[PDB]
Amino acid sequence: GIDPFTMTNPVTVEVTRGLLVESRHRGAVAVVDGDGKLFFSLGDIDTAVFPRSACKAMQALPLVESGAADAYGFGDKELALACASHNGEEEHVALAASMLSRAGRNVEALECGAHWSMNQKVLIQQARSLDAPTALHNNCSGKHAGFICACCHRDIDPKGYVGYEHPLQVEIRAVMERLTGAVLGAESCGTDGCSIPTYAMPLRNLAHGFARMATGTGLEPLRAKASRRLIEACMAEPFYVAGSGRACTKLMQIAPGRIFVKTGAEGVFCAAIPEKGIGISLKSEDGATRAAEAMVAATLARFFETEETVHAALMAFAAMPMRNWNGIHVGDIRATSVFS
Amino acid sequence: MTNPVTVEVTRGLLVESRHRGAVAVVDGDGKLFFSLGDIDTAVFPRSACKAMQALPLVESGAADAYGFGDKELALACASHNGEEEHVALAASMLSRAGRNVEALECGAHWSMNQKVLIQQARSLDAPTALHNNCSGKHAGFICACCHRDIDPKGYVGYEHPLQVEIRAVMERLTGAVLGAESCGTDGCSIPTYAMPLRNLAHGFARMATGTGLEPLRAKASRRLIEACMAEPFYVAGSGRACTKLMQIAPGRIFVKTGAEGVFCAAIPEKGIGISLKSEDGATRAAEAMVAATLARFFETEETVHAALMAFAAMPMRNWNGIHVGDIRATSVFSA
Ligand SMILES: [Cl-]
Ligand SMILES: [Cl-]
Ligand SMILES: [Cl-]
Ligand SMILES: [Cl-]
Ligand SMILES: [Zn+2]
Ligand SMILES: [Zn+2]
Structure with missing residues (x-):
């Protein structure tokens, strides 16, 4: 059933070996329509959690609403990369570089730092072709290139764009408060892996924010239109949201153009199904990616019980x-029967 | 019974993620010194019990016949990084028995340490079975067989004499019941048996103290525990928690990780064995937990306590x- 206020997370994912459960994950899930009605919940959907990268499409709204995406000729690939935690494959690197180039900038404008790929096969390729990764290899380089482009198109100096009171961060707080209805302030702020603010908010608000983006409900016309554009870009070019071998890319290849998903660090997932009017958020309590992936797949599968081939493909991830x-x-690694 | 929160991961002012788990600290007589959570539910030890599985290599006389020292014994007890020294040592152990890489039945994998993985990718097209973290343990198994003229082919199999012997050794050390219904296949294709954390901790306390063990098994157990503490690079390697934790108080603390968030440990001078499991299987939680549990026993040795708390x-x-x-172990470890 639905309990808005429980603090206890049920076991959502079991990892077996032989005939026994070897490890177990607990977690929470909120499924909300565009009006904010709760269709399904599990666990604590009221305590603030950090979305990390799961909310990158919300953070990409300045890039689109400012007119910068159109001024620089950005299409679905660039918008998907701005919404991405990408693997740092060379296709991602070259595209981020071209986004900076069109705004008259280069890798030196990035303030996120560098890291080796979090995908092992890509890491092996990087190790064999690079002495060291650059800032363009950072999983957030498309998001940060989007930030720099939003500033340059508006003649705002991008220097310091990571800082809490830089005008870009002021604008992103306002966007996120409006989409989610959450209160965002320093007391709920941490610093992300890419050195920008990340704001903790209840899973229910996060899911409602995605339901609004997916449906337009409660949004002013330009934000509704820009939200559709970002969601459609991610579904159209899902390699650019994640990359080779990645669950977000493969999940968005099951039912092309119909399912939006995005992972965040520490076991967050957000998702939306525009034709059903729904947004989803979830977190595995311990932060494991494998648990969040099984949970998002099992939750999505409930909306496709009438379409066997889609249902079976989603259940393969659950x-x-x-x-x-x-x-x-x-x-x-199996989602438990709380999802059935 | 719900396990307590043992590890919190914070971001900003808030707890971002939480891990639950269980810990057993048992003395050589089987008395429980400290516990958290459910220490009775069966847990797969994975590589955390490698030192128990190394007893055939020592007790059979194979280690002495082949001229093995503490480095080889530590490697037999290791989840090593697959650095060049580990690879060369596992190859050398196989060669003493008249075998080679082809005798290994564990498969190959890239290092689970990122810096070593980068070095491997730059120097190799693909890893070999020697790079497997379990290659020293498996070389030890093959040497135990060859020394006794047991055919090592199929040594991973459930009724191969080596696996029969390992079950008998581990039932004696731990008091647990081992059988097919509590068995799974481990990462290196041998059996791994789920047992209560209490029994696993008691087994390590018996190895560390000799209590309850026959003389040859007590002596071989001490040899193995001491080798690991004497050559802790060979148990894990560069950058690794098990190696660093055994460099804090040289010769005094034994630790061993297992996949899916297991740790075992022992403190021989205190007559203590330790086992624990992060319920979600996270290595970061098991590492903080083993450090915080060890720290409980060193609170008045400031330099040792501080170095353990740096991992907690x-x-x-x-x-x-x-x-x-x-990433911090919670207050239940200091209560
Ligand atoms: Cl709006
Ligand atoms: Cl994971
Ligand atoms: Cl007792
Ligand atoms: Cl005995
Ligand atoms: Zn980021
Ligand atoms: Zn193994």
Whole structure:
């Protein structure tokens, strides 16, 4: 059932080995329509959680609403990259560089720092082709290029754009408060991996914000139109949101143009299904990506019970097999029956 | 019974993520010194019990016949990084028995340490079975077989004599019941048996003290525990928690990680064995937990206590080097 106020997270994902549960994850999920009505919840959807990268599409609204995306000729690939936690594959790097170039800037304008890919196969490619990663390899480089472009198009100096009272960060707080109805302030702020603010808010508000983006409900016309554009871009070019081997990219290849998903660090996922009018947010309590992936897939699957092929493809992510170094099947990562 | 929150991960002013888990600290006589959570539910030890699985290599006489020292014994007890020294040592152990890389049945994998992984990617097209974190343990298994003229082919199999012997050793050390219904296949394709954390901790306390063990098993157990503490690079490697934790108080603390958030440990001078599990399987939580549990026993040795608390409460810095939060064992470890 639905409890807006419980503080207790149920077991949402089991990891088996042999015939026994070896590890278990707890978590919380909110599913909300464009009007804010709760369709499904699990666990604590009231305590503030940090969305991390899961809200990058909300943070991309300045890039679109300012007219910068249109002025620089950005299409679906650039918008998807601005919404991305990308693998740092060379396609992502070259596209981020071209976004900066069109605004008259380069990698030196980035304030996010560098890191090696969090995808092991891409990390191996990076190690073999690079002495060290650059800021363009950072998973947030498309988001940050979007920030720099939003500033340059408006003649706002991008220097310091990560700072709490830089005009860009002022604007992003206002956007996020309006979309989500949450109160965003220093007491709920932390610093993200890319050195910008990240604001903790209840999962219910996060899901409602995505439901609004997906449906337009409660949004002024320009924000509704820009939200559609960002959601459609991510669904149209899902490699640019994540990349090779990544669950967000593959989830958005199951039912092309119909499902929006986005991961955040520490086990957050956000999602939306525009044709159903719904937004989803969730978090695995311990922060594991594998648990958040199984949870988002099991939650999405409930909306596709009438379409076997889509349902089966989503359930393949809700129940993932594990193989050891010899290829032997050893167990599975499975969403529990709370999702059924 | 719901396990308590053992580790909090903060960001800004707030707890961002939380881990639950269980810990058992048992003496050589089986008395429980300290526990958190449910220490009775069966848990897979994974690599945390490698030192128990190394007993055939020592007790059979194989280690002495092949001229093994503390480095080889530590490697037999290791989840190593697959650095060049680990690879060369596992190859050398196989060669003493008249075997080679082809005798290994564990498969190959890239290092689970990122810096070593980068070095491997730049120097190799692909890892070999020698790079597997379990290659020293498996070389030890093959040497135990060959020394006794047991055919090592199929040594991973449930009724191979080596696996029969390992079950008998581990049932004696831990008091647990091991059988097919509590068995799974581990990462290196051998059996791993789920057992209560209490029994696992008691087994390590028996290894560390000799209590309840026959003389040859007590002596071999002491040899293995001491080798690991004497050569802690060979148990794990550069950058690794198990190696650093065994460099804090040289010769005094034994630790061993297992996949899915297990740790085992022992403090021989206190007659203590330790086991624990992060319920969600996170390595970061198990590392903070083992450090905080060890710290309980060193509170009046300030330099040792401080170095253990540095693993119990770890800062997190972002890509620009800014402190963003912490990974901290909770107050239940100091209560
Ligand atoms: Cl609006
Ligand atoms: Cl994970
Ligand atoms: Cl007792
Ligand atoms: Cl015995
Ligand atoms: Zn970021
Ligand atoms: Zn192994």
